[PDB]
Amino acid sequence: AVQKVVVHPLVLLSVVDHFNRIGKVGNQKRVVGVLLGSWQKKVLDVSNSFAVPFDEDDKDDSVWFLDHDYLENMYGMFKKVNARERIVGWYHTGPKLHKNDIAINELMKRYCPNSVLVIIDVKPKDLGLPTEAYISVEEVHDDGTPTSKTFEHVTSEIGAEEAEEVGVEHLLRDIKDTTVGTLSQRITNQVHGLKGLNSKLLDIRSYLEKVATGKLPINHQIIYQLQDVFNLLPDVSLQEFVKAFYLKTNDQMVVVYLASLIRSVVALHNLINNKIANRDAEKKEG
Amino acid sequence: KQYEKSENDLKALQSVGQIVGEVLKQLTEEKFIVKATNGPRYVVGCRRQLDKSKLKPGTRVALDMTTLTIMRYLPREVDPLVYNMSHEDPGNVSYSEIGGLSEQIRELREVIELPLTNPELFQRVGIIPPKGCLLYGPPGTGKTLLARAVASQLDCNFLKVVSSSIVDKYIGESARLIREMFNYARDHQPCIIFMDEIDAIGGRRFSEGTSADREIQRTLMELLNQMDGFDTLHRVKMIMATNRPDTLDPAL
Amino acid sequence: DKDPILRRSGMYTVAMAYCGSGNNKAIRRLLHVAVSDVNDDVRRAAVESLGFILFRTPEQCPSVVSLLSESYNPHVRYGAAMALGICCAGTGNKEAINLLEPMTNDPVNYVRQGALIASALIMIQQTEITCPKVNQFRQLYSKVINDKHDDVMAKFGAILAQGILDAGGHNVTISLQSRTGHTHMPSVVGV
Amino acid sequence: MVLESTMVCVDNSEYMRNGDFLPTRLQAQQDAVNIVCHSKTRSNPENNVGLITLANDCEVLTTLTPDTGRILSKLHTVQPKGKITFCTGIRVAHLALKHRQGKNHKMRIIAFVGSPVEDNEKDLVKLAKRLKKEKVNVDIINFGEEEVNTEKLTAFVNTLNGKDGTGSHLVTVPPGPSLADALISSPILAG
Amino acid sequence: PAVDTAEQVYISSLALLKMLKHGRAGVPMEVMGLMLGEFVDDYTVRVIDVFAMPQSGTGVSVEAVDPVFQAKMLDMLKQTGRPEMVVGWYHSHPGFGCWLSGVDINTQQSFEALSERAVAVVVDPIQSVKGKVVIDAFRLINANHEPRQTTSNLGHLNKPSIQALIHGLNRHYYSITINYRKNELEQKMLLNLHKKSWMEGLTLQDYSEHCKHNESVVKEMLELAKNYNKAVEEEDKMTPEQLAIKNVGKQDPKRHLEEHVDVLMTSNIVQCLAAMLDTVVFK
Amino acid sequence: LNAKVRLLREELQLLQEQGSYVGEVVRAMDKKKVLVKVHPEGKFVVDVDKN
Amino acid sequence: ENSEKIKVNKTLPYLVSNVIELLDVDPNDQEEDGANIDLDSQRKGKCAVIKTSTRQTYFLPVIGLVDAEKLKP
Amino acid sequence: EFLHAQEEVKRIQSIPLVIGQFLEAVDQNTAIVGSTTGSNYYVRILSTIDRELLKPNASVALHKHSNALV
Amino acid sequence: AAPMSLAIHSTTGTRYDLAVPPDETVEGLRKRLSQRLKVPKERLALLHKDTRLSSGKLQEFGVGDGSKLTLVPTVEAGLMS
Ligand SMILES: Nc1ncnc2c1ncn2[C@@H]1O[C@H](COP(=O)(O)OP(=O)(O)O)[C@@H](O)[C@H]1O
Ligand SMILES: [Zn+2]
């Protein structure tokens, strides 16, 4: 079981390049390829990738073709160039999971038994990470009865080596705004978090509307998870919670007030020094 | 074959050496402090596919000439002097060639050989086996013969040195050589260090003397701290032969 | 737009649209881009456009371009030079010449080139009595052109400055507005 | 001499157990595709041929490769099982030889139908017209003799090569215990 | 017959990252590879991708070991949608700056003989830092006059480095400006790289740890205030020059107090605001 | 702020200028020359800058 | 031609040195192609450590034009 | 831009540096450092260096050529 | 005569198509290409069907008429040699 997948920026940019070139060729919607990488005791590391021929019928979810001979040849060449990287999984730029993904994963499992799928949205109309990691798992039900092969989410993050970090930072002269202070602690979170939460709740609302009207059938597991969520929603009118909240807020504001007092004294010191300097300069000039 | 040799020579011509240094400390993943034997200290990188757990504070290293990057870690250096000490040839004298010395052979063996074959007896009794012996007597009695017999017939590593030969004109080099010799013994345990003619450097420490005298006494102090000091020796034995035991330091 | 050239065209269209209007909105946008953008060409164009925007009040262009001229970015310094030149063409502004004089020996060759061309544009046709530095700048142009260990772009600027200072014989001036107060489209486009 | 990228569609269905056609239809078809691959390679050294099965849904075993040893070796362990999906198999073959190694090569599909095809006439004719537009030739072998007739196959081939196209083919073999390689003579030579 | 100085070499983000990663991997050696691209016009040499090749050598030289790999790689990239062919080669100079040596010039001569406008790119990994990457593009000068024609100022904007000038710049080879044109998807992905998960933004921070950190910093600020009181009494009995060297090897209470104030304010304000936001959002 | 940034931008090439030896003066002499011991090297009879 | 190259590369001025050691070294593990060094690995023979008369120590991955077995510390 | 410049001046901190010893501070932006090659110098201090850490006889790294305290 | 015309593809893209005697050797072909490109013959490397052509006659390597060859220049970097 994978606990985390680390996708390096070179993999993402290579995926973008593959998508762009196949699109320039034309008549395609999703791109597929291999993810070479390495293992670090349940913390994956995807470092490199290469393109692979792939086509699918836009109507039938059973007419798809992946050139495994080309996959093997290119893997041999990549191994000849860098031995420490071995096949770890496959990637596809499709915005969301397709129905052929389990079949493609079964094909790739003959090259990597613990294959990990990474979906890279090259046109992200959202506010969040661009990578979603999935691992194929057998699901046993209680009423759904037949055990199907379903895709299970795995935490994905972006990391980089020193050279990759240097290159990305050099290339990031598009819009650079570090402001690590309260400004960034207000934009990168708070606003972004609330917007993402609203997006997720809107997705849940859309699904619930579809279910209630009758476009989609009922999923007991989804309904159960929603019940658990609504149960977890806390209550903030309890006297004990209110009192604890006020106590902690008072402590934080004590510290804030002391910091502001220090700031004011420093400002006064600077003003006195500046006035001394200006008076001395005027006296000397006179 | 001639053309194979010529091609090998041409290929070998275009190869540059590597500075040899010592690693003092690792600052980060890709930053080490290295002290070239010349004297200067550099902050240097390390080749990626290198076991950096093996670059401890003291490991010898080969540095690239241009970028000073660490490219290899090497075993501890053995001075040519110490190599020559270890590579002496005491003929093939056997214990049958020595006559009249049975008790002395027994004692010397009890000190050097027995603890290196049957430590269990000493462990059972509850004593650490003795370390050093001093072979003293009139000239021509068989001290060097006994040392040669031990070296030839025993299987441990042997280091033969002459105390007169240990000395050097430059300040501190005699002590440096003693330190290198004992480090060699510690590395190649088990080892026997035979200092023939000890009275050359081991003599009573005077109060009034000269610069050369004080240098020799410093060499002797280094030797004493090596034999018994802050670091125990364990599996290194010592044999010393002198015609003049009277003129020796009580510490020794 | 994401293309730096398209952003530069944006700055230029701001200039041409609000040519000689003294529009505070346009000046605000130009200064924001000049002090914020990531591309030095876009910064240069943003600083340059201020001359077109403010050419009807030459006394004010120095007040906005002095600090930009004294900056860490040579591209913005060149933009300030050319902005002063366009704003005070055919005016012999004392403040403009004073701002340009320190920049004529800037470390950067193209900054020197822009400073020389702007000085020529400003001092076209002006005599010793009218402007007390025309002879000095003439000698400066000659010195730069003659020095054999100076930058080629600085020499280019010096030669162009000599050409501009004595134009049409000596019987022509550069003015972005006609004698009646109307914007001269040929001259705006030419500059 | 003619460049051709020909994908072979082999039938590993449950009707291949039948021993009517020599030592089991599986071995008969093995020898048949052996001769066909050798014929293509001899016809052009650069010609490339691949392999696809028409099992439960489909399975691609060897994409276009100039050599034939790998194709023949993979042909072993083609033990029969499941039904035959003609439309899906041919579509997959079409995709595979659309993703060619060399675009100057021609495109061909040699299909061994040794079992009834459950696809209606309308779907098969639609596939025929699509393949005609895409310029694919389909040599169909009516192996197996489960219907040994125009089992919705002559319509396919005639739709393909309609209007004197003479590009496709349909060789129908009787159950006569004669080597399928011995029987095939039209597509190999008079293609 | 010109070769103008406004010509530029467009390096893709993927190519730059690949070059830098390979160069840094081969820190003591001059690891090398090929650049694929197109010759668009006489004012552009687009570099869209680079792939390393099997090579072996010492710290004084590096050479490729097989050309079959290069041919096969070109073919197998064309088969997947990269018909671009070689337009140059790249190799890394680890710490020597950017320039070409004699062997580099010989290789570039071979590449020029094959294709007229082929270029060489030298990337120095170790001298590269986060903000800036040390990289340059080169081409040779024949045995002739001026190597290029200037129809703009674009060429003369770089101030060639002293090391390159010493090693032969503008005498045996000339530089070409490097530009980093990007597409919309590349820009978006580069911006999105550092974006964190939404839940991380709203997640609070253990109150025990938060209070402990606040307590520690306030306790430190107490001693800093003592030292600040001591330091304020000075600055009048101090020479105008002595003040600067007064803060050399000795702590600066004012600076440390300002830093601690900033950190405390940021942490506490963020925590309080997050607490209130969660209080409302979650019922 | 602008002056700070400009100094930090020219400092990279300002820092590659060669340092200066630190020597101990023995005695001034002659027209304008001085005798200096540049440890660990020997002595020199060096000039003096006009300032 | 090869002999001429050897002669021209053997320019007369040498620097006397003493051979401190004749180490034995072996390859460690697989080295990724693209960046593989013939010295750190792919060297199975005998390597020399020498001390030049200038008091400079050096490691010699390739001994040179003198066979290793002849040299002694 | 100042934050950018600080990160771009660190390329003067290339890996192959020479360890030295910081003896005395002269003016600020200058100092006297004793290299391990056995010679002293009057060199310039990098602006980004934290002057609190420059305790007397503190180990410092100097540029290989310029010998600047880096 | 019966000249044997062989296509010579290059990694860059240029095509140096040329015809040689049917008995032409690999060394002779390399010499002709070096004369054409003004490059030392040791730099160039001819390929054929994913196998480098070392030395000998062209025929026994399978090189007939209308056969594709690839020309990969050697790539070398360093400070000396
Ligand atoms: N007990 C002995 N048995 C045999 N030979 C002896 C004996 N003592 C001395 N020798 C002779 O003396 C020589 C070695 O001198 P040795 O006695 O070992 O050193 P030292 O004379 O310093 O005590 C040998 O050549 C050996 O023949
Ligand atoms: Zn080079």
mmCIF file with all atom_site columns, N, CA and C in Angstrom, chain E residues 10-25:
data_model
loop_
_atom_site.group_PDB
_atom_site.id
_atom_site.type_symbol
_atom_site.label_atom_id
_atom_site.label_alt_id
_atom_site.label_comp_id
_atom_site.label_asym_id
_atom_site.label_entity_id
_atom_site.label_seq_id
_atom_site.pdbx_PDB_ins_code
_atom_site.Cartn_x
_atom_site.Cartn_y
_atom_site.Cartn_z
_atom_site.occupancy
_atom_site.B_iso_or_equiv
_atom_site.pdbx_formal_charge
_atom_site.auth_seq_id
_atom_site.auth_comp_id
_atom_site.auth_asym_id
_atom_site.auth_atom_id
_atom_site.pdbx_PDB_model_num
ATOM 1  N N  . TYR E 1 10 ? 15.391 29.695 -28.667 1.00 0.00 ? 10 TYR E N  1
ATOM 2  C CA . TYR E 1 10 ? 14.258 29.533 -27.765 1.00 0.00 ? 10 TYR E CA 1
ATOM 3  C C  . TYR E 1 10 ? 14.370 28.177 -27.084 1.00 0.00 ? 10 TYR E C  1
ATOM 4  N N  . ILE E 1 11 ? 14.601 28.190 -25.776 1.00 0.00 ? 11 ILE E N  1
ATOM 5  C CA . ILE E 1 11 ? 14.765 26.973 -24.990 1.00 0.00 ? 11 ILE E CA 1
ATOM 6  C C  . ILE E 1 11 ? 13.474 26.726 -24.227 1.00 0.00 ? 11 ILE E C  1
ATOM 7  N N  . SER E 1 12 ? 12.895 25.545 -24.412 1.00 0.00 ? 12 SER E N  1
ATOM 8  C CA . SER E 1 12 ? 11.688 25.187 -23.689 1.00 0.00 ? 12 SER E CA 1
ATOM 9  C C  . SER E 1 12 ? 12.013 24.881 -22.230 1.00 0.00 ? 12 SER E C  1
ATOM 10 N N  . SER E 1 13 ? 10.990 25.004 -21.383 1.00 0.00 ? 13 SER E N  1
ATOM 11 C CA . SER E 1 13 ? 11.161 24.692 -19.970 1.00 0.00 ? 13 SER E CA 1
ATOM 12 C C  . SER E 1 13 ? 11.622 23.254 -19.782 1.00 0.00 ? 13 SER E C  1
ATOM 13 N N  . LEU E 1 14 ? 11.043 22.328 -20.545 1.00 0.00 ? 14 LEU E N  1
ATOM 14 C CA . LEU E 1 14 ? 11.436 20.928 -20.441 1.00 0.00 ? 14 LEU E CA 1
ATOM 15 C C  . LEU E 1 14 ? 12.906 20.750 -20.791 1.00 0.00 ? 14 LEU E C  1
ATOM 16 N N  . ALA E 1 15 ? 13.346 21.379 -21.881 1.00 0.00 ? 15 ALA E N  1
ATOM 17 C CA . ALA E 1 15 ? 14.740 21.265 -22.286 1.00 0.00 ? 15 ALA E CA 1
ATOM 18 C C  . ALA E 1 15 ? 15.665 21.826 -21.219 1.00 0.00 ? 15 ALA E C  1
ATOM 19 N N  . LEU E 1 16 ? 15.325 22.993 -20.671 1.00 0.00 ? 16 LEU E N  1
ATOM 20 C CA . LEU E 1 16 ? 16.178 23.602 -19.656 1.00 0.00 ? 16 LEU E CA 1
ATOM 21 C C  . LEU E 1 16 ? 16.282 22.715 -18.425 1.00 0.00 ? 16 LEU E C  1
ATOM 22 N N  . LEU E 1 17 ? 15.151 22.180 -17.959 1.00 0.00 ? 17 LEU E N  1
ATOM 23 C CA . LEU E 1 17 ? 15.179 21.345 -16.766 1.00 0.00 ? 17 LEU E CA 1
ATOM 24 C C  . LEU E 1 17 ? 15.970 20.067 -17.009 1.00 0.00 ? 17 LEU E C  1
ATOM 25 N N  . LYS E 1 18 ? 15.791 19.444 -18.177 1.00 0.00 ? 18 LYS E N  1
ATOM 26 C CA . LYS E 1 18 ? 16.551 18.240 -18.493 1.00 0.00 ? 18 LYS E CA 1
ATOM 27 C C  . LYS E 1 18 ? 18.046 18.534 -18.518 1.00 0.00 ? 18 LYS E C  1
ATOM 28 N N  . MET E 1 19 ? 18.431 19.625 -19.184 1.00 0.00 ? 19 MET E N  1
ATOM 29 C CA . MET E 1 19 ? 19.839 19.991 -19.259 1.00 0.00 ? 19 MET E CA 1
ATOM 30 C C  . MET E 1 19 ? 20.428 20.178 -17.871 1.00 0.00 ? 19 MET E C  1
ATOM 31 N N  . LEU E 1 20 ? 19.775 20.986 -17.037 1.00 0.00 ? 20 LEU E N  1
ATOM 32 C CA . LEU E 1 20 ? 20.291 21.247 -15.704 1.00 0.00 ? 20 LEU E CA 1
ATOM 33 C C  . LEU E 1 20 ? 20.350 19.997 -14.842 1.00 0.00 ? 20 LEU E C  1
ATOM 34 N N  . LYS E 1 21 ? 19.320 19.153 -14.869 1.00 0.00 ? 21 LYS E N  1
ATOM 35 C CA . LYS E 1 21 ? 19.340 17.924 -14.095 1.00 0.00 ? 21 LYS E CA 1
ATOM 36 C C  . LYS E 1 21 ? 20.468 16.993 -14.508 1.00 0.00 ? 21 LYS E C  1
ATOM 37 N N  . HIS E 1 22 ? 20.665 16.777 -15.809 1.00 0.00 ? 22 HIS E N  1
ATOM 38 C CA . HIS E 1 22 ? 21.760 15.920 -16.250 1.00 0.00 ? 22 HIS E CA 1
ATOM 39 C C  . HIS E 1 22 ? 23.115 16.512 -15.876 1.00 0.00 ? 22 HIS E C  1
ATOM 40 N N  . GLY E 1 23 ? 23.289 17.819 -16.082 1.00 0.00 ? 23 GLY E N  1
ATOM 41 C CA . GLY E 1 23 ? 24.555 18.443 -15.743 1.00 0.00 ? 23 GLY E CA 1
ATOM 42 C C  . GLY E 1 23 ? 24.876 18.321 -14.269 1.00 0.00 ? 23 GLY E C  1
ATOM 43 N N  . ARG E 1 24 ? 23.886 18.573 -13.411 1.00 0.00 ? 24 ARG E N  1
ATOM 44 C CA . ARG E 1 24 ? 24.117 18.457 -11.977 1.00 0.00 ? 24 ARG E CA 1
ATOM 45 C C  . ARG E 1 24 ? 24.399 17.014 -11.585 1.00 0.00 ? 24 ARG E C  1
ATOM 46 N N  . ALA E 1 25 ? 23.718 16.059 -12.223 1.00 0.00 ? 25 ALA E N  1
ATOM 47 C CA . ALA E 1 25 ? 24.007 14.658 -11.944 1.00 0.00 ? 25 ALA E CA 1
ATOM 48 C C  . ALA E 1 25 ? 25.462 14.336 -12.247 1.00 0.00 ? 25 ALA E C  1
#
